[PDB]
Amino acid sequence: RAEPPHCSKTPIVRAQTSQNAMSRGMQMQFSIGLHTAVCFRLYLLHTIRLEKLEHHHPITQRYTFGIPEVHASCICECDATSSTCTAESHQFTACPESDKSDETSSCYRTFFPNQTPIGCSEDDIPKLCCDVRFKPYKNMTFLAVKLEQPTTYATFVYAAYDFVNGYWVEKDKTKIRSQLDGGTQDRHLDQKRRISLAVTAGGRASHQLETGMYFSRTSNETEELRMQPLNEITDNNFDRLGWYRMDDSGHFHVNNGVVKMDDIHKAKVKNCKEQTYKSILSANHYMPGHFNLTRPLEVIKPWIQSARIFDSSLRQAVVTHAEGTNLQISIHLESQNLVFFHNASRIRDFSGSIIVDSKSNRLFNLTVYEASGKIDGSVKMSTGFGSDTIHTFTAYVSDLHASNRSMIIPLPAIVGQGARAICLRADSMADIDKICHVIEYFESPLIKGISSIGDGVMIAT
Amino acid sequence: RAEPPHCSKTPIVRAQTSQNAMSRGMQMQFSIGLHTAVCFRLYLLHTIRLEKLEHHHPITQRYTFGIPEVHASCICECDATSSTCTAESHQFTACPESDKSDETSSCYRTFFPNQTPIGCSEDDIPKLCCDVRFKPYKNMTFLAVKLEQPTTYATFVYAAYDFVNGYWVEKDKTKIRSQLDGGTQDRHLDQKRRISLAVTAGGRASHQLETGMYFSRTSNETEELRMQPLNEITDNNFDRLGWYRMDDSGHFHVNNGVVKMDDIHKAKVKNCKEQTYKSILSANHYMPGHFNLTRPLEVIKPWIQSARIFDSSLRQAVVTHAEGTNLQISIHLESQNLVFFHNASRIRDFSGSIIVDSKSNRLFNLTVYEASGKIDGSVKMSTGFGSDTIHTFTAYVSDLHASNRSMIIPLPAIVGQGARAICLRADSMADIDKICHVIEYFESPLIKGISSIGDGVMIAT
Amino acid sequence: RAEPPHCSKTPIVRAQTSQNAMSRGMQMQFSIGLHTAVCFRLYLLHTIRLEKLEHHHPITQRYTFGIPEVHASCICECDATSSTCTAESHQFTACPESDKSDETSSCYRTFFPNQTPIGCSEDDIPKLCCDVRFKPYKNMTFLAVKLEQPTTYATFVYAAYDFVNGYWVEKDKTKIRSQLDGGTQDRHLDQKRRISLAVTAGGRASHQLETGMYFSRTSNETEELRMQPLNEITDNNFDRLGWYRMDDSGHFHVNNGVVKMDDIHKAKVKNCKEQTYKSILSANHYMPGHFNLTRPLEVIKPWIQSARIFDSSLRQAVVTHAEGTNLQISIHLESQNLVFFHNASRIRDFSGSIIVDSKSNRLFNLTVYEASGKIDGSVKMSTGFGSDTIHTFTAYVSDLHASNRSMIIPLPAIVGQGARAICLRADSMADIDKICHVIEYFESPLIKGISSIGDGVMIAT
Numbered sequence A, B, C: 001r002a003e004p005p006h007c008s009k010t011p012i013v014r015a016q017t018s019q020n021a022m023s024r025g026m027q028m029q030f031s032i033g034l035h036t037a038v039c040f041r042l043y044l045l046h047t048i049r050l051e052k053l054e055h056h057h058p059i060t061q062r063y064t065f066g067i068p069e070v071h072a073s074c075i076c077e078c079d080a081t082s083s084t085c086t087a088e089s090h091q092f093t094a095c096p097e098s099d100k101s102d103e104t105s106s107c108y109r110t111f112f113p114n115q116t117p118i119g120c121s122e123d124d125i126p127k128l129c130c131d132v133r134f135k136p137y138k139n140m141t142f143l144a145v146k147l148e149q150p151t152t153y154a155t156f157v158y159a160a161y162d163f164v165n166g167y168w169v170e171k172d173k174t175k176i177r178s179q180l181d182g183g184t185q186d187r188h189l190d191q192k193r194r195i196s197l198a199v200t201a202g203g204r205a206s207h208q209l210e211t212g213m214y215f216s217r218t219s220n221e222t223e224e225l226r227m228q229p230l231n232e233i234t235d236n237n238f239d240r241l242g243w244y245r246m247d248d249s250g251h252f253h254v255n256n257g258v259v260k261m262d263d264i265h266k267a268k269v270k271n272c273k274e275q276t277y278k279s280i281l282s283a284n285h286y287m288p289g290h291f292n293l294t295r296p297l298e299v300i301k302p303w304i305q306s307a308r309i310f311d312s313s314l315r316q317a318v319v320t321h322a323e324g325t326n327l328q329i330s331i332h333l334e335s336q337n338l339v340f341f342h343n344a345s346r347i348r349d350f351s352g353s354i355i356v357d358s359k360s361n362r363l364f365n366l367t368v369y370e371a372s373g374k375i376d377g378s379v380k381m382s383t384g385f386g387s388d389t390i391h392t393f394t395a396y397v398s399d400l401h402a403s404n405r406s407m408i409i410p411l412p413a414i415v416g417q418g419a420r421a422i423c424l425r426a427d428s429m430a431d432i433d434k435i436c437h438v439i440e441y442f443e444s445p446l447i448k449g450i451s452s453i454g455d456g457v458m459i460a461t
């Protein structure tokens, strides 16, 4: 079933190699695009496809965390002198071992004195004492990772085809890997070692995930990286993720719970007689009602194809680019001849909608029909075909044979509200063949839990 | 009044287009600079000017905020048992409705017990009770915006001029827009559709505003974006902007005021008899005496021409680059001929000063007189002309006709303290024409409010 | 002892300069790599070496800070009414002047009432009073600096050599400086002013230190910049560096100590009779046992050669790149001839190990023996020579004469655990000369202080 990719139309620059005090070469220069192919014959058709663009972020920090289910049970003591409900019993301490109660649960005590005598005597100033309880919700487990400045790699696919009696035959097929952060990188591509591929980047990739805190879910086991305010290992913000952390054993606890609990737990007596109180947690990312989970970066970020922790060693994360800038190629050899070939660009029809998504992304959700090669778009002013061009684009369909593909076209802010015409034309197609349609514009836009003790009072009068 | 821009001197690379199993083209390649023009004739003079470079950041978060005017009124109760000044009346509660008092005001209550008996009896431990009041200052309103990784666009200006009887005539004039983050983008430029402009970026722009929190003022209505420590929607740091937020109705409130007020308001009794107390707010960005407003990015950042929220929909912000890297151009056609033209570079005189600004920017505040084209500078070691060159620069004046322009020249750290010579020479000018001057070096460098209640005590003994 | 650098093998593109209504030039185009040289003769051998790549970050914020040695002495008062240990004496106040005690010490008082009567009477509720003391540890002093978006400069070395009777003679030798963030920069290189060097960057450097907070040690005096969670001037997080700040005089104090001390100091009575208590600081970066110092960026970050505050004025920091992308060069002249030369690439042997360091860096710690020029590596699948290639690299040794050098080779994540073969071959060397070795894989991975007062109680009953 062996078949070459669509050979793109690329201008070629003939450069001449410098010389030493010896025996007069030449280099063939061109700019290859990501997710496109280049074809040539040596005077067996040679093809190179810039398949993948990846960033390899080192993982500097790591820590497992979860989402806690919080429950607070209190008790009031009317007499400020009483032995029950005290600083030594409640202030900065975990409620001692119940022996039967769950191993997964994690509790912390807080001391609330200087109360108002409601359902009490006018002179005696009450005191409140609470057990803040935390257990994992739905057994949700995530790894938190600190991704720092990456190394960039390009992945090329070298294939050599032959036309033997009516059909194509993939003779040789390799994967070429080249580091893009330094100078030129050079290697032979064919088995015959006659030809050399030289890859050079202009500067940094058009895109790169920002150095920061990331995470993904764990299935008792890595998954698609997400981004939501998360705490660096050394930080403990209660409004950001990771204050409920998993230790070695698999036991979850509130990071410096003992000490911090009194700054994040706030309770006031409603009536000491009925044993009623107002309670809250001055935090986020807890259950109930304080936790929603952000979708993977892949989903929300069009430039991202995938963003995942590479393996079980948890040392690097790989960001696979969906959109990237071209790379500079030079093909060199002794002294022979090189000719570059290119298939034609075609298009039957297209469909799509202009959308501003919930994450503020302005794109044209384009779908091409029976298409191949380089396809040129022109976004128009009004609904009228022939109105003024406001943006001009070029999409590249990688299929040798005309097929139906779906793609995302980033648009400038000039492509504002209201429906408008868009005109697609393949490469070197007469303006009679140019398909036009009126495209639609869509746009997506962007506490106290009062309880009566329940457990009853053991110390009434 | 139709006139072409200064046609820059640019080397042109002749590349040959690849071929298919059909009918032997050619492509003209060159690197266009931002704020410069390129001229050519087809064998009507064709001109292309790289006019604008813009980043289009999606706005992920949004919230209106203000600056609060804070006022705290207190009262002391000598007897720790008293019904006046209590946890239920003061701890975690907004002072109930006054019915006459301002709608714009926002108040919060705090409870300060366990006091020292100053102007009281040696055994009874006092208690203090305060109403922290907040109202907008000068009706100042700002939108807070979260700018994330942008899409880059180039804006070109295509104009075709003709010389009809002594004067130039702008025949055709278009605006070309090309996305710079992906592969090559291609479109026709002339009405005749004979010529095609192909734009390719090397990698990311030399500059890009960092993903973070930004804001600008609102005039009851967007303005020039500023940068000052500001809170992300989900965060509530009191030392950073946006803790005083505007809801739907236009009412400003302290974000989670009720709960947090006791962590940020700190008061101690001075004398319970005279009703004197020491008061403070453990926050920033409040009035009086705790608020200065950072100038727009445009002002402080030389690389920024403008940074503004694009429109009323508040979905994207546009950063217009003042300084940027060159773009790769290729002009292609059937088979005809292309010749590139360039006007000469001139300079009468210059003036300027070497400055290190308050924001640590080392630049040469250059002013050119009766100048056009490419102008070459050479910064010298000492005040002596002919001393060793320490930096070499090239500025490009876009005016066809010699005019007076002012510009910013970024300098390395080697261009240290003390006055020195700088020598300017236009392109291809003999070293006799080279203007020299000794340039001057300038350098810019980088709580408790105690009150006696006033309202008097209603509860004396 | 004058000697040229290894002249690299570089393809040269012949471009033709545009023309005006006057007298037909030409430009020689090539991509120079960082830490490599280019050689040519004009028809005295001319050499240009891209020596240095630097980022010049402006320093927007500055503040000296230290590391504090913390000591807390307390005292308990059993009777809640007592004149000793009070809100006025302890809450939000510095312990008044001792007159003899150290000038370097900085103390703060905290008030802990509503205690439990341990070693006391069942009805009287105690109170605790502490003096938190802070002094510099080991007289450690550091400057905190805010580095913002930099300006990029390239530093070239132009040298012209002559071969006079058996040996080379360095005739002319200059340092060329070119700004990389804008358009093309142009200057003459030779004393004869015949030749012009034109430098153009594709986009941003492959690497750039992130805008943020940095610091380095001071020797009573700048040093190698480090990175560790540090507070921006306006922020006061106790879990991050710089809360212990040095004022003008050289006196260190806790940033807003008075006010914050009660939020970060937490103490509970153990027994009021014996005068025993549990004490802690809810902070980081303090002594004892809460401070380790991060190594310089140079050490941890392979892409960084050096990162240092430039000088005594403390206005800019210079980041010297160890790894960077190529720059675009064009050499132009009247009308004459240019020929480019290149020495050969050689290699005797090599040694090294594949390492994943503590900071998650995957690299090949390569050491070359009797080597010069362009050296090509091929990382193999298994230990077997001849197994499948998984990565391909190219290193450039700058020595004209074959010497022994050590280098860092960034590797993709595909180069996983276990030993494997790596094959090095110089440029244009037959596959017989290719040295192979099996290389080893190494991998580095990533509270309450209870005291009895000691000072004794002055107020027993």
Ligand SMILES: *[C@@H]1O[C@H](CO)[C@@H](O[C@@H]2O[C@H](CO)[C@@H](O)[C@H](O)[C@H]2NC(C)=O)[C@H](O)[C@H]1NC(C)=O
Pocket (backbone or CB within 6 Å): A007, A039, A041, A044, A045, A163, A341, A342, A343, A344, A400, A401, B019, B020, B021
């Ligand atoms: C795509 O382009 C290639 C390369 O130009 C074409 O390949 C030729 O295939 C035929 C049979 O169709 C042979 O007889 C030729 O010798 C091939 N050329 C070379 C240079 O090896 C190809 O057919 C085109 N395909 C489509 C689907 O448009």
Ligand SMILES: *[C@@H]1O[C@H](CO)[C@@H](O[C@@H]2O[C@H](CO)[C@@H](O)[C@H](O)[C@H]2NC(C)=O)[C@H](O)[C@H]1NC(C)=O
Pocket (backbone or CB within 6 Å): B007, B039, B041, B044, B045, B163, B341, B342, B343, B344, B400, B401, C019, C020, C021
């Ligand atoms: C700038 O350069 C242009 C293009 O080389 C010059 O344009 C010519 O204008 C004259 C009249 O002055 C005509 O007779 C020519 O045919 C034009 N050339 C082309 C190629 O169309 C121009 O005059 C120069 N201007 C300045 C102010 O220096």
Ligand SMILES: *[C@@H]1O[C@H](CO)[C@@H](O[C@@H]2O[C@H](CO)[C@@H](O)[C@H](O)[C@H]2NC(C)=O)[C@H](O)[C@H]1NC(C)=O
Pocket (backbone or CB within 6 Å): A019, A020, A021, C007, C039, C041, C044, C045, C163, C341, C342, C343, C344, C400, C401
């Ligand atoms: C490196 O390359 C240079 C340049 O090609 C060689 O330089 C020549 O030196 C010899 C003496 O050895 C002279 O007679 C030539 O005229 C030089 N050439 C030029 C163009 O000026 C050089 O010897 C080579 N060196 C090594 C160590 O390999």
Ligand SMILES: *[C@@H]1O[C@H](CO)[C@@H](O)[C@H](O)[C@H]1NC(C)=O
Pocket (backbone or CB within 6 Å): A138, A139, A220
């Ligand atoms: C998860 O809790 C579940 C129920 O939600 C239980 O089946 C299981 O033993 C727990 N284990 C882990 C490893 O999360």
Ligand SMILES: *[C@@H]1O[C@H](CO)[C@@H](O)[C@H](O)[C@H]1NC(C)=O
Pocket (backbone or CB within 6 Å): A352, A353, A355, A365, A366, A367, A406
């Ligand atoms: C986007 O494009 C694909 C392909 O046509 C389709 O599944 C989907 O409906 C589109 N979504 C929107 C919102 O246009």
Ligand SMILES: *[C@@H]1O[C@H](CO)[C@@H](O)[C@H](O)[C@H]1NC(C)=O
Pocket (backbone or CB within 6 Å): A369, A370, A402, A403, A404
């Ligand atoms: C493309 O979709 C259309 C129907 O909308 C049809 O012309 C065609 O069969 C589809 N698939 C391919 C591979 O051409």
Ligand SMILES: *[C@@H]1O[C@H](CO)[C@@H](O)[C@H](O)[C@H]1NC(C)=O
Pocket (backbone or CB within 6 Å): B138, B139, B220
């Ligand atoms: C602003 O307060 C002013 C006085 O500063 C008053 O004229 C006005 O009604 C207020 N309105 C808004 C919308 O800010």
Ligand SMILES: *[C@@H]1O[C@H](CO)[C@@H](O)[C@H](O)[C@H]1NC(C)=O
Pocket (backbone or CB within 6 Å): B352, B353, B355, B365, B366, B367, B406
């Ligand atoms: C900078 O340049 C302009 C133009 O000459 C002028 O308005 C201004 O005085 C200059 N400022 C300084 C500080 O040199």
Ligand SMILES: *[C@@H]1O[C@H](CO)[C@@H](O)[C@H](O)[C@H]1NC(C)=O
Pocket (backbone or CB within 6 Å): B369, B370, B402, B403, B404
């Ligand atoms: C430039 O300024 C000078 C005076 O400093 C003068 O030569 C000239 O008239 C000015 N303007 C133009 C457009 O040349």
Ligand SMILES: *[C@@H]1O[C@H](CO)[C@@H](O)[C@H](O)[C@H]1NC(C)=O
Pocket (backbone or CB within 6 Å): C138, C139, C220
């Ligand atoms: C540093 O403390 C030392 C001992 O560690 C003492 O010799 C000296 O006077 C102090 N001075 C400064 C400037 O740090």
Ligand SMILES: *[C@@H]1O[C@H](CO)[C@@H](O)[C@H](O)[C@H]1NC(C)=O
Pocket (backbone or CB within 6 Å): C352, C353, C355, C365, C366, C367, C406
């Ligand atoms: C890295 O390379 C150098 C040079 O051979 C050597 O000093 C050192 O042992 C190496 N370290 C490791 C861990 O391989």
Ligand SMILES: *[C@@H]1O[C@H](CO)[C@@H](O)[C@H](O)[C@H]1NC(C)=O
Pocket (backbone or CB within 6 Å): C369, C370, C402, C403, C404
């Ligand atoms: C390189 O090291 C080896 C020994 O490991 C030896 O061949 C040689 O003398 C050394 N130095 C140079 C400059 O060649």
